[PDB]
Ligand binder design. Structure first.
Ligand SMILES: Nc1ncnc2c1ncn2[C@@H]1O[C@H](COP(=O)(O)OP(=O)(O)O)[C@@H](O)[C@H]1O
Ligand SMILES: [Mg+2]
Lengths: 375, 729
C-alpha cells in the first residue's frame, strides 16, 4: 500500500476473466472477455445508459448488444477493448490504483509476440504500472495443484494446452497447442441441438449454447451402452432452464460432444484426440522424465469440471502410457480458477520481485524488455 | 537511605571499601592482578595459554585468556553502579554482584539497568520512609532502588511531561510481581487503589490461563503484558488498564518433555468435582490428545488447591458462578477438540468423520450444531463479496483447523477474562492524562536447542532490546550534547537490526521466519525443505549461522543477542499454522450457550509468525512512544538458598538481560568521564607537576596534566564539565 508493493492478479481470456490480487483465495469478480455494443445506440427504451458494455454488462444485455471478442486461442483482436476489460477489472471491480500496485497477467503457452507487445505496451502506458509480470497460464495451474513437476494440461473453452514440467522446461514442441477446445464442442452442441429441433443463429444464442454446456455436459465412459441407456426421455434426460424464458432439453447428447474431444471423427475429422496429442507431447521427453510426468499428471480447465472426466481421462492416459510407470492424474478441488490461483500464489511470494518487469525497464528497452527478461 | 543500623537501610546502603586514595600503586597490586574468578598474577604468556599464579590458592596454573581479565582496584568492591568501574571487565562485575547480594544489597545499578537479584526473603528496604528518601532525589544521590527509578519516571511525567514505561524483564519469579508492586507502591504514596486488589487476584487467574511449565522455570508467563497506570495531569494516580501480547497459543495444544501446557488444563481435570466433571465432560489426563505426554504432575504441588484458588479469585473478580463454569466449559471443549481426528482419505482429505463423538462433546459444551460445525470444517467457505467460495481443505488442514480453533478459543477466553480484569481495574471516571506503562515480560529463553516458540520469543526480545540500545545511544549522545563531545559513534540498535531482519524480513530475500511462512503455504512443503531454504538464503544473512555438513540436515543456528542459539526446526511447519475457520466463528456467535455467543458476539489463517509480528509491532510502538526505564530480574540461585549467588546462573542471565551486552556498549563509549576539578584531584599524585589538585584555567590545566600523563586523544575527549574517558583509561 502506497509505499509497499502488494501485487495484483488478472487472469483474462475469451471464457472468463478472474479479478484478484496477490495472496487472495478466490477471484473478486468473474466475467468473460466480451464487450457489447448497442444495435441502436444513443437513446434506447431498454439500455444501461452506455454505448459500450463490458463482461457481465455485455452478458446481461445480450438481447440488445452485439457481442465482440477482444480475445479470440488467446489472441488479441481488439487491444482498445482490452483496455476496457482491464478498466472493468482494475477500476470497477478491484477498484485499485494501477499506478501503485504491480500487476500479474496470464498467458497461454506459445503466445505470439504481437500479443505480448499489445499487453505490455498498454500496462506501461495506459494503466502505467510500477511493475508487471506475464505468467504462463498452464504452469500457474501446476502450482495451484500443489506440484512443481508433472504433466500440466489445461483444457477449457478458449484453447487446450499441455506444458510438461520437469528438471528443465518444455520447449516449443513439447508444449501442446490444441485447436480442439470447448469452443468446438459448443458449436457442435449447437448443431446437434438443431438435430433435436433447436436454432441458435445469433452470437448471443451461440453463447447460450455454451451456457447450456456448462451445466449438462456429461463425460461418458461407455458411449454406446450409455447412449442406449440415456434414451430414457424422462428420468435421465435433463433440460437447461435459461434465466430469461428459454428451456433447452438435451438427452443422450449430453455426452456426445465430449466424444468429439477424444475422437474428432465424431465431428468428421481425422485429427488426433486430446489424449493422443497429449501423448504426442509426452513423447518429446525422456523415458525417465515421462515416468515422473505420468506420476503427477495435473489436469484442470472447463473440460475437467464435467462429471466422469476423472475416470475417462485416467483410462485414456493409461491406454497411451507404459504399464510399468506410475500413472496418476491430479485433480485439484478447484480446477476452474486453477490458473488464477497460481498467479495469486506466485505474486504473494517474494520470487515475484525477480520475475516482474518494471516501468523503468520498459521505458528504457521498450516493448523488447519482455524477451530481454525472459522468452 | 544511608544507615545500616536501621533495617530499612540495612540491605540498602553500600557499606564498602573506603580507602579514598587516588594513587594506583597504593590501591592496586603492583603485579598483573587477575563463574567466580580466583585472585591471580600473570606469570607467562604462551599465546592464549597464559600461566598465572592463582594467588587465591597459591597455584601456578596455565590458563586460557578466556578466563583472564584485569581485576579492578579493591576500592570498587560493591559500588552502587557497575559503570563506576575503571575497566569494565565482567569478572569484577560478577564479583561485585556476588558480594553485594551476599551483603544484602539486592538492588544494583549497571549503567541504565536497575538490577534486582531475588533475596528469597522479605527485605524491609521499601518502607514509606524509604519512599520519602527517594522522593525528589537525583538517582545517584541514593543507593540503587526501583523507587529511585520510579521517582525518575514520575517526575519525568510530572516535570518533563513525558510518558514513561518500565521495561522490567528477565527471569519469571525473580521479583516478578514484586518489582511491579514496588513501582506502584512508590507512587501509591507519592502520587496520591482498591480495584488493584482485584488485579492481584487477576494475576493467578491469568497465570492459570497464561503461565506454563518449562525446563528452566515452572511458572513462566507465555505472553508479555504491561500495566498502564493512568495519571492525572497534575501527577496523581487515577486508574489503570492492562494488555497482553504474543500469547504462546501453541502451548495450549502441545507440550514438550518436561513441560506442561497452560496450567488451567490441569487444574480443571484434577480439581473438578465429580459433578463438575460430568457437567463439563471431563475425562482423565490420558483421555486427551492434548496434554499427551507423561509430564503431567509437578513434585510437591497440588492442582486441586490451585484450581479452587483460581475459582476463589474469580469470585472476587466478579465472575458469576455460571460464567466461571462457562469458562471451564470452554477449557474442557478445547481439550475435546484435541480429541477430534480426521478421515484418512487418500486425496488431501476433504476428510472424513466415521465417528465425531469428540466433536459432539465440544458442541455439547458450546451449544452449537455439530453437523454444521463438521461440515464447514470439511469444506471452509470463504465469503468473497456477494459470492462465497467453498474452499475445500485437506484432512490435514482440517486437523489443523481444529487445533486452530482450539488455540483461538483459548485466546478468546483469555482475552475475555483479561477484559473483565480491566472492567474491574479500569475505573470509569478518571483524567488519564499521562501514564506509566509497566512492562512485565520474560527475557531471552535459551535451552540446549530451541524451537519456534523460542525463536518468536527471542525475536520479540531483540526488538525490545533494540529499544534499549537505541535509547541508550541517545542518552549517551545527550550527555555528549550537554558537553562538547563529538564522538557520534553509531546507533547501537543497528547491532540488532540485521538480527531482527533475519527474522522479520519478508519480501527481498526472506528471513528465517518468512521462509517458514513460505513453506507453510506450498501444499507439499516439508521441514527438510524449509531447512534447505535456509541453506539457500543464508548466504545473504550475515547473522545466520549455517551448521555443520551433517548438522545442516535439520538444525541450524542464529547469532542472537543473548548468544548463538541452535534451533531445531524438525516440525515448524506444523506450528506456524492456524487455519481458523470463521464459519465456526459464526456458529459460535450463533451458540445456545450465551457465554460463548458473547465471546464471539461479532466477527483469515495467516501465519502465527506474522500474527506475532503484528502484536509485537503494537507493543513496541507503544513502548517507543514512551521513555524506556530499565529493570532486570535475576535468579542467583535456583535452590532458593537466600544469600547464595551462583555467578554461572547470573552471567547467563546478565547476557539474557542485556546487561553484559550493555557493558559492551559502555566499553564502546566513555565510562570513566571525569569532572575537570575532580581530574586535577584524581591525578595530582599521578604526575601533577605544574598543575596541582586545583588551578585557575579549568580546562587547560587538566589538559596540561593529560599531556604529562601522555594520554591518547582517541581514548578521551574534552567536554564542558567533564573529560570523557574510555574504559581502562
Ligand atoms: N459448474 C460448472 N460445471 C462445469 N463446467 C463449469 C462450471 N462452471 C464453469 N465451468 C466451465 O469451466 C471453464 C472455466 O475455465 P477457465 O480456465 O476459466 O476458462 P477459459 O480458460 O476457457 O477462459 C469454462 O469452460 C466454464 O464453462
Ligand atoms: Mg485451469
Amino acid at each position: 500500500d502506497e509505499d509497499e508493493t502488494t501485487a495484483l492478479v488478472c487472469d483474462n481470456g475469451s471464457g472468463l476473466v478472474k479479478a484478484g490480487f496477490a495472496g487472495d483465495d478466490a477471484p473478486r469478480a468473474v466475467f468473460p472477455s466480451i464487450v457489447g455494443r448497442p444495435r441502436h445506440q444513443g437513446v434506447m427504451v431498454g439500455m444501461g445508459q452506455k454505448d459500450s458494455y463490458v463482461g457481465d454488462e455485455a452478458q446481461s444485455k445480450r438481447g440488445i448488444l452485439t457481442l465482440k471478442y477482444p480475445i479470440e486461442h488467446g489472441i488479441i483482436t481488439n487491444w482498445d477493448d482490452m483496455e476496457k476489460i482491464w478498466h472493468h477489472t482494475f477500476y470497477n471491480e478491484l477498484r485499485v490504483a494501477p499506478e501503485e500496485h504491480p500487476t500479474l497477467l496470464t498467458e497461454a503457452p506459445l503466445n505470439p509476440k504481437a500479443n505480448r507487445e499489445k499487453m505490455t505496451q498498454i500496462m506501461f502506458e495506459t494503466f502505467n504500472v510500477p511493475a508487471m509480470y506475464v505468467a504462463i497460464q498452464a504452469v500457474l495451474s501446476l502450482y495451484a495443484s500443489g506440484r512443481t513437476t508433472g504433466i500440466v494440461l489445461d483444457s477449457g473453452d478458449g484453447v487446450t494446452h499441455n506444458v510438461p514440467i520437469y528438471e528443465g522446461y518444455a520447449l516449443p514442441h513439447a508444449i501442446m497447442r490444441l485447436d480442439l477446445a470447448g469452443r468446438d464442442l459448443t458449436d457442435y452442441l449447437m448443431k446437434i441441438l438443431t438435430e433435436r429441433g433447436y436454432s441458435f443463429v445469433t452470437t448471443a444464442e451461440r453463447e447460450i449454447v455454451r451456457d447450456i454446456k456448462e451445466k449438462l455436459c456429461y463425460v461418458a465412459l461407455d458411449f454406446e451402452n450409455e447412449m442406449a441407456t440415456a434414451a430414457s426421455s424422462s428420468s435421465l434426460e435433463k433440460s437447461y432452464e435459461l434465466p430469461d424464458g428459454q428451456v433447452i432439453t438435451i438427452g443422450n447428447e449430453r455426452f456426445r460432444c465430449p466424444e468429439t474431444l477424444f475422437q474428432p471423427s465424431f465431428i468428421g475429422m481425422e485429427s488426433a484426440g486430446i489424449h493422443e496429442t497429449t501423448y504426442n507431447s509426452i513423447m518429446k521427453c525422456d523415458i525417465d522424465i515421462r515416468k515422473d510426468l505420468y506420476a503427477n499428471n495435473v489436469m484442470s480447465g472447463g473440460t475437467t469440471m464435467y462429471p466422469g472426466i476423472a475416470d475417462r481421462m485416467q483410462k485414456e492416459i493409461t491406454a497411451l502410457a507404459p504399464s510399468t510407470m506410475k500413472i496418476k492424474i491430479i485433480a485439484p478441488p478447484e480446477r476452474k480458477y486453477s490458473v488464477w490461483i497460481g498467479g495469486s500464489i506466485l505474486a504473494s511470494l517474494s520470487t515475484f520481485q525477480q520475475m516482474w518487469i518494471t516501468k523503468q525497464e520498459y521505458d528504457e528497452a521498450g516493448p523488447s524488455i519482455v524477451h530481454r527478461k525472459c522468452f | 537511605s544511608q544507615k545500616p543500623l536501621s533495617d530499612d537501610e540495612k540491605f540498602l546502603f553500600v557499606d564498602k571499601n573506603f580507602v579514598n586514595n587516588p594513587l594506583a600503586q597504593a590501591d592496586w597490586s603492583a603485579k598483573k592482578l587477575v563463574h567466580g574468578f580466583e585472585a591471580a598474577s600473570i606469570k607467562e604468556e604462551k599465546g592464549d595459554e597464559v600461566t598465572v599464579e592463582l594467588q587465591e590458592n597459591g597455584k601456578k596454573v596455565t590458563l586460557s585468556k578466556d578466563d583472564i581479565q584485569k581485576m579492578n582496584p579493591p576500592k570498587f568492591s560493591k559500588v552502587e553502579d557497575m559503570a563506576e568501574l575503571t575497566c569494565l571487565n565482567e569478572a569484577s562485575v560478577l564479583h561485585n554482584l556476588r558480594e553485594r547480594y551476599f551483603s544484602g544489597l539486592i538492588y544494583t545499578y549497571s549503567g541504565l539497568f536497575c538490577v534486582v537479584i531475588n533475596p528469597y526473603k522479605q527485605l524491609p528496604i521499601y518502607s514509606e520512609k524509604i519512599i520519602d528518601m527517594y522522593k525528589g532525589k537525583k538517582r545517584h544521590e541514593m543507593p540503587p532502588h526501583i523507587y529511585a527509578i520510579a521517582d525518575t519516571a514520575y517526575r519525568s511525567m510530572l516535570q518533563d511531561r513525558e510518558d514513561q514505561s518500565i521495561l522490567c524483564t528477565g527471569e519469571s519469579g525473580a521479583g516478578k510481581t514484586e518489582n511491579t508492586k514496588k513501582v506502584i507502591q512508590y507512587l501509591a504514596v507519592v502520587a496520591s487503589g482498591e480495584l488493584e486488589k482485584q488485579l492481584l487476584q487477576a494475576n493467578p487467574i491469568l497465570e492459570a490461563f497464561g503461565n506454563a511449565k518449562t525446563v528452566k522455570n515452572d511458572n513462566s508467563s507465555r505472553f508479555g503484558k504491561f500495566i498502564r497506570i493512568n495519571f492525572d495531569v497534575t501527577g496523581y494516580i487515577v486508574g489503570a488498564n492492562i494488555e497482553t501480547y504474543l500469547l504462546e497459543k501453541s502451548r495450549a495444544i502441545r507440550q514438550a518433555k518436561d513441560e506442561r501446557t497452560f496450567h488451567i488444563f490441569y487444574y480443571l481435570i484434577a480439581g473438578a468435582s465429580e459433578q463438575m466433571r460430568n457437567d463439563l465432560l471431563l475425562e482423565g489426563f490420558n483421555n486427551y490428545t492434548f496434554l499427551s505426554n507423561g509430564h503431567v504432575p509437578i513434585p510437591a504441588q497440588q492442582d486441586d488447591e490451585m484450581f479452587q484458588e483460581t475459582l476463589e479469585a474469580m469470585t472476587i473478580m466478579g465472575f458469576t458462578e455460571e460464567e466461571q463454569t462457562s469458562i471451564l466449559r470452554v477449557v474442557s471443549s478445547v481439550l475435546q477438540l484435541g480429541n477430534i481426528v480426521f478421515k484418512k482419505e487418500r486425496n488431501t482429505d476433504q476428510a472424513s468423520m466415521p465417528d465425531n463423538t469428540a466433536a459432539q462433546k465440544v458442541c455439547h459444551l458450546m451449544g452449537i450444531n455439530v453437523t454444521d460445525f463438521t461440515r464447514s470444517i470439511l469444506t471452509p467457505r470463504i465469503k468473497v463479496g456477494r459470492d462465497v467460495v467453498q474452499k475445500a481443505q485437506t484432512k490435514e488442514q482440517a486437523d489443523f483447523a481444529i487445533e486452530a480453533l482450539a488455540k483461538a478459543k483459548f485466546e478468546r477466553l483469555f482475552r475475555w477474562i483479561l477484559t473483565r480484569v480491566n472492567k474491574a481495574l479500569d475505573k470509569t471516571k478518571r483524567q488519564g492524562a499521562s501514564f506509566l506503562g509497566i512492562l512485565d515480560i520474560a527475557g531471552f529463553e535459551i535451552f540446549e536447542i530451541n524451537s519456534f516458540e523460542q525463536l518468536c520469543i527471542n525475536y520479540t526480545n531483540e526488538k525490545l532490546q533494540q529499544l534499549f540500545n537505541h535509547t541508550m545511544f541517545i542518552l549517551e549522545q545527550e550527555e555528549y550534547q550537554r558537553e562538547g563531545i563529538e564522538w557520534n559513534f553509531i546507533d547501537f540498535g543497528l547491532d540488532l537490526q540485521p538480527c531482527i531482519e533475519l527474522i522479520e524480513r519478508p519480501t527481498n530475500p526472506p528471513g528465517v521466519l518468512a521462509l517458514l511462512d513460505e513453506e507453510c503455504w506450498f501444499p507439499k512443503a516439508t521441514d527438510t525443505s524449509f531447512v534447505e531454504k535456509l541453506i539457500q538464503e543464508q548466504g545473504n544473512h550475515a547473522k545466520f549461522q549455517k551448521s555443520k555438513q551433517l548438522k545442516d540436515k535439520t538444525e541450524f543456528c542464529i547469532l542472537h543477542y543473548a548468544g548463538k542459539v541452535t534451533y531445531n526446526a524438525s516440525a515448524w511447519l506444523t506450528k506456524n499454522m492456524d487455519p481458523l475457520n470463521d464459519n465456526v466463528t459464526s456458529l459460535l456467535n450463533q451458540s445456545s450457550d450465551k457465554f460463548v455467543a458473547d465471546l464471539w458476539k461479532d466477527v483469515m489463517f495467516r501465519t502465527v509468525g506474522q500474527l506475532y509480528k503484528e502484536q509485537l509491532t503494537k507493543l513496541m510502538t507503544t513502548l517507543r512512544n514512551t521513555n524506556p526505564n530499565f529493570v532486570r530480574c535475576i535468579i542467583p540461585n535456583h535452590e532458593k538458598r537466600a544469600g547464595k549467588l551462583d555467578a554461572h546462573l547470573v552471567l547467563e542471565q546478565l547476557r539474557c538481560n542485556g546487561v553484559l551486552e550493555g557493558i559492551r556498549i559502555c566499553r564502546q563509549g566513555f565510562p570513566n568521564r571525569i569532572v575537570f576539578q575532580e581530574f586535577r584531584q584524581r591525578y595530582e599524585i599521578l604526575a601533577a607537576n605544574a598543575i596541582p589538585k586545583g588551578f585557575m584555567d579549568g580546562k587547560q590545566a587538566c589538559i596540561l596534566m593529560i599531556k604529562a600523563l601522555e594520554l591518547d586523544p582517541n581514548l578521551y575527549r574534552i567536554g564542558q564539565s567533564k573529560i570523557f574517558f574510555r574504559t581502562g583509561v
